[PDB]
Amino acid sequence: MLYRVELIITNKEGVRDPEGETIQRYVVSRFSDKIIETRAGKYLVFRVNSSSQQEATELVKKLADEMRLYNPIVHKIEIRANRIE
Amino acid sequence: MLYRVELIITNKEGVRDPEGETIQRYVVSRFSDKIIETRAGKYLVFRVNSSSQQEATELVKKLADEMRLYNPIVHKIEIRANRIE
């Protein structure tokens, strides 16, 4: 089975996000006062050979942990997956 | 009426993605041969006041275009929205 696994890495709610803060202040706020907040993060999407959706998702979380794609104390992650082909 | 609008910006399929290429080569490939590809992008999430889901998403689309959050000739964008509160 081939899975498309998405990994979204963002800052925890209580940790300052300089990119989102800056974009909101100098770009978004000027464009529209209907957009009240901007949070920024990293998006990584993987193609994964696996035996199940669980195996694919857990594999990516392990990657994120072991290979330090994020810092558990300041960042939070979200993993979404879907079978493809 | 509040909407959570996600904006994912990635490179078009035919345009080199240096981050994805590099992560795959030096980090992912080393971690697991079951992860065959990595594509990288930016993730931005906005909280938007709007009268409809359409108004909220088109507004973020306009933001992305007018304020140059991406280059349409080399980047692709995906917008997802969900009502909150």
mmCIF file of C-alpha atoms in Angstrom:
data_model
loop_
_atom_site.group_PDB
_atom_site.id
_atom_site.type_symbol
_atom_site.label_atom_id
_atom_site.label_comp_id
_atom_site.label_asym_id
_atom_site.label_seq_id
_atom_site.Cartn_x
_atom_site.Cartn_y
_atom_site.Cartn_z
ATOM 1 C CA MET A 1 0.000 0.000 0.000
ATOM 2 C CA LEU A 2 1.122 3.544 -0.796
ATOM 3 C CA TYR A 3 0.097 6.383 1.499
ATOM 4 C CA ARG A 4 0.322 10.134 1.160
ATOM 5 C CA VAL A 5 1.197 11.362 4.654
ATOM 6 C CA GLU A 6 1.030 15.036 5.598
ATOM 7 C CA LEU A 7 2.983 16.501 8.516
ATOM 8 C CA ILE A 8 2.090 19.967 9.764
ATOM 9 C CA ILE A 9 4.463 21.467 12.346
ATOM 10 C CA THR A 10 3.403 24.574 14.276
ATOM 11 C CA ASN A 11 4.283 26.385 17.503
ATOM 12 C CA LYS A 12 2.409 25.533 20.681
ATOM 13 C CA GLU A 13 -0.260 28.066 21.629
ATOM 14 C CA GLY A 14 1.849 29.570 24.391
ATOM 15 C CA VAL A 15 5.031 29.982 22.350
ATOM 16 C CA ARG A 16 5.692 33.082 20.240
ATOM 17 C CA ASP A 17 5.491 32.497 16.479
ATOM 18 C CA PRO A 18 7.626 35.273 14.913
ATOM 19 C CA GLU A 19 6.612 34.516 11.341
ATOM 20 C CA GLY A 20 2.872 34.571 12.005
ATOM 21 C CA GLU A 21 3.235 37.618 14.239
ATOM 22 C CA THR A 22 5.157 39.520 11.589
ATOM 23 C CA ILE A 23 2.949 38.476 8.666
ATOM 24 C CA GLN A 24 -0.157 39.495 10.605
ATOM 25 C CA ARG A 25 1.315 42.850 11.575
ATOM 26 C CA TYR A 26 2.836 44.042 8.309
ATOM 27 C CA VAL A 27 0.906 42.147 5.654
ATOM 28 C CA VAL A 28 -2.418 40.683 6.776
ATOM 29 C CA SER A 29 -3.605 43.503 9.030
ATOM 30 C CA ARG A 30 -3.092 45.911 6.131
ATOM 31 C CA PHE A 31 -4.951 43.693 3.656
ATOM 32 C CA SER A 32 -8.107 43.023 5.673
ATOM 33 C CA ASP A 33 -9.341 43.654 9.197
ATOM 34 C CA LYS A 34 -11.533 40.554 8.825
ATOM 35 C CA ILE A 35 -8.449 38.336 9.154
ATOM 36 C CA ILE A 36 -7.751 38.573 12.882
ATOM 37 C CA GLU A 37 -4.850 36.166 13.399
ATOM 38 C CA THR A 38 -2.079 34.386 11.466
ATOM 39 C CA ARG A 39 -0.135 31.338 12.676
ATOM 40 C CA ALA A 40 2.724 29.976 10.607
ATOM 41 C CA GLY A 41 4.267 26.547 10.361
ATOM 42 C CA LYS A 42 5.965 23.992 8.157
ATOM 43 C CA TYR A 43 4.247 21.603 5.784
ATOM 44 C CA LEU A 44 5.931 18.350 4.745
ATOM 45 C CA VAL A 45 4.191 15.697 2.663
ATOM 46 C CA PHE A 46 5.558 12.187 2.243
ATOM 47 C CA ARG A 47 4.823 9.239 -0.010
ATOM 48 C CA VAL A 48 5.017 6.120 2.151
ATOM 49 C CA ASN A 49 5.005 2.403 1.356
ATOM 50 C CA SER A 50 3.203 0.668 4.200
ATOM 51 C CA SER A 51 0.998 -2.252 5.210
ATOM 52 C CA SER A 52 -1.633 -0.021 6.823
ATOM 53 C CA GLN A 53 -2.611 3.583 7.476
ATOM 54 C CA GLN A 54 -1.474 3.080 11.065
ATOM 55 C CA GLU A 55 1.964 1.853 10.047
ATOM 56 C CA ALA A 56 2.411 4.842 7.710
ATOM 57 C CA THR A 57 1.308 7.453 10.248
ATOM 58 C CA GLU A 58 3.313 6.020 13.152
ATOM 59 C CA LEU A 59 6.343 5.810 10.885
ATOM 60 C CA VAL A 60 6.172 9.516 10.091
ATOM 61 C CA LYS A 61 5.695 10.455 13.740
ATOM 62 C CA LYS A 62 8.767 8.365 14.575
ATOM 63 C CA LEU A 63 10.658 10.191 11.820
ATOM 64 C CA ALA A 64 9.588 13.542 13.245
ATOM 65 C CA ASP A 65 10.676 12.458 16.727
ATOM 66 C CA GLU A 66 13.934 10.646 16.107
ATOM 67 C CA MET A 67 15.221 12.889 13.326
ATOM 68 C CA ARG A 68 14.252 16.067 15.225
ATOM 69 C CA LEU A 69 11.968 17.624 12.614
ATOM 70 C CA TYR A 70 10.416 19.490 15.540
ATOM 71 C CA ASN A 71 11.039 20.217 19.228
ATOM 72 C CA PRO A 72 8.324 18.599 21.427
ATOM 73 C CA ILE A 73 8.657 21.341 24.048
ATOM 74 C CA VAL A 74 7.907 24.250 21.702
ATOM 75 C CA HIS A 75 6.180 22.714 18.677
ATOM 76 C CA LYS A 76 3.115 20.576 18.132
ATOM 77 C CA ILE A 77 2.469 18.342 15.124
ATOM 78 C CA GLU A 78 -0.480 17.042 13.126
ATOM 79 C CA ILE A 79 -0.374 14.011 10.860
ATOM 80 C CA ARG A 80 -2.977 13.330 8.168
ATOM 81 C CA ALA A 81 -2.820 10.348 5.832
ATOM 82 C CA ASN A 82 -4.702 8.908 2.883
ATOM 83 C CA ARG A 83 -4.155 5.882 0.667
ATOM 84 C CA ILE A 84 -3.312 6.728 -2.925
ATOM 85 C CA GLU A 85 -2.960 5.159 -6.374
ATOM 86 C CA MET B 1 -19.215 34.077 12.137
ATOM 87 C CA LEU B 2 -15.642 32.832 12.370
ATOM 88 C CA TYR B 3 -13.733 30.494 10.069
ATOM 89 C CA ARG B 4 -10.392 28.759 10.452
ATOM 90 C CA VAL B 5 -8.741 28.979 7.048
ATOM 91 C CA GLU B 6 -5.637 26.948 6.239
ATOM 92 C CA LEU B 7 -3.301 27.908 3.396
ATOM 93 C CA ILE B 8 -0.727 25.388 2.201
ATOM 94 C CA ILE B 9 1.860 26.683 -0.277
ATOM 95 C CA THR B 10 4.064 24.211 -2.163
ATOM 96 C CA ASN B 11 6.175 24.121 -5.318
ATOM 97 C CA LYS B 12 4.614 23.028 -8.587
ATOM 98 C CA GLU B 13 5.477 19.457 -9.567
ATOM 99 C CA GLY B 14 7.947 20.546 -12.226
ATOM 100 C CA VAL B 15 9.835 22.992 -10.014
ATOM 101 C CA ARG B 16 12.737 21.895 -7.807
ATOM 102 C CA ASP B 17 11.978 21.918 -4.072
ATOM 103 C CA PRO B 18 15.395 22.301 -2.391
ATOM 104 C CA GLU B 19 14.087 21.711 1.126
ATOM 105 C CA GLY B 20 12.188 18.542 0.262
ATOM 106 C CA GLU B 21 15.082 17.274 -1.847
ATOM 107 C CA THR B 22 17.571 17.900 0.932
ATOM 108 C CA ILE B 23 15.453 16.469 3.755
ATOM 109 C CA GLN B 24 14.790 13.331 1.722
ATOM 110 C CA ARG B 25 18.444 12.863 0.837
ATOM 111 C CA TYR B 26 20.125 13.437 4.190
ATOM 112 C CA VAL B 27 17.391 12.744 6.733
ATOM 113 C CA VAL B 28 14.444 10.688 5.495
ATOM 114 C CA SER B 29 16.335 8.297 3.245
ATOM 115 C CA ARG B 30 18.565 7.503 6.226
ATOM 116 C CA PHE B 31 15.608 6.898 8.561
ATOM 117 C CA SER B 32 13.460 4.639 6.372
ATOM 118 C CA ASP B 33 13.525 3.289 2.839
ATOM 119 C CA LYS B 34 9.726 3.043 3.022
ATOM 120 C CA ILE B 35 9.416 6.830 2.813
ATOM 121 C CA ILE B 36 10.151 7.388 -0.885
ATOM 122 C CA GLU B 37 9.645 11.138 -1.297
ATOM 123 C CA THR B 38 9.445 14.383 0.677
ATOM 124 C CA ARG B 39 7.900 17.627 -0.585
ATOM 125 C CA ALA B 40 8.158 20.742 1.557
ATOM 126 C CA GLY B 41 6.014 23.832 1.854
ATOM 127 C CA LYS B 42 4.656 26.574 4.054
ATOM 128 C CA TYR B 43 1.610 26.301 6.280
ATOM 129 C CA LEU B 44 -0.364 29.373 7.333
ATOM 130 C CA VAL B 45 -3.591 29.251 9.308
ATOM 131 C CA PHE B 46 -5.888 32.244 9.692
ATOM 132 C CA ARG B 47 -8.915 33.039 11.827
ATOM 133 C CA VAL B 48 -11.367 34.918 9.606
ATOM 134 C CA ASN B 49 -14.571 36.842 10.260
ATOM 135 C CA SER B 50 -16.908 36.310 7.335
ATOM 136 C CA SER B 51 -20.531 35.879 6.308
ATOM 137 C CA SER B 52 -19.854 32.570 4.554
ATOM 138 C CA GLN B 53 -17.260 29.865 3.942
ATOM 139 C CA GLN B 54 -16.940 31.108 0.367
ATOM 140 C CA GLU B 55 -16.254 34.683 1.428
ATOM 141 C CA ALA B 56 -13.596 33.513 3.899
ATOM 142 C CA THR B 57 -11.700 31.300 1.444
ATOM 143 C CA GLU B 58 -11.804 33.723 -1.486
ATOM 144 C CA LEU B 59 -10.555 36.390 0.913
ATOM 145 C CA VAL B 60 -7.514 34.314 1.815
ATOM 146 C CA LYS B 61 -7.024 33.506 -1.864
ATOM 147 C CA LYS B 62 -7.009 37.241 -2.604
ATOM 148 C CA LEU B 63 -4.578 37.825 0.266
ATOM 149 C CA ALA B 64 -2.208 35.214 -1.133
ATOM 150 C CA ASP B 65 -2.391 36.764 -4.598
ATOM 151 C CA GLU B 66 -2.322 40.474 -3.830
ATOM 152 C CA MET B 67 0.226 40.375 -1.013
ATOM 153 C CA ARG B 68 2.499 37.896 -2.834
ATOM 154 C CA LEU B 69 2.502 35.091 -0.278
ATOM 155 C CA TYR B 70 3.376 32.882 -3.244
ATOM 156 C CA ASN B 71 4.500 33.080 -6.877
ATOM 157 C CA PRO B 72 1.801 31.523 -9.126
ATOM 158 C CA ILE B 73 4.368 30.652 -11.801
ATOM 159 C CA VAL B 74 6.315 28.365 -9.467
ATOM 160 C CA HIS B 75 4.003 27.686 -6.509
ATOM 161 C CA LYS B 76 0.689 25.896 -5.965
ATOM 162 C CA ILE B 77 -1.726 26.702 -3.131
ATOM 163 C CA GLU B 78 -4.409 24.751 -1.299
ATOM 164 C CA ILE B 79 -7.013 26.389 0.905
ATOM 165 C CA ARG B 80 -9.133 24.512 3.443
ATOM 166 C CA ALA B 81 -11.697 26.170 5.689
ATOM 167 C CA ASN B 82 -13.949 25.167 8.564
ATOM 168 C CA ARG B 83 -16.365 27.170 10.687
ATOM 169 C CA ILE B 84 -15.472 27.455 14.363
ATOM 170 C CA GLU B 85 -16.649 28.862 17.726
#
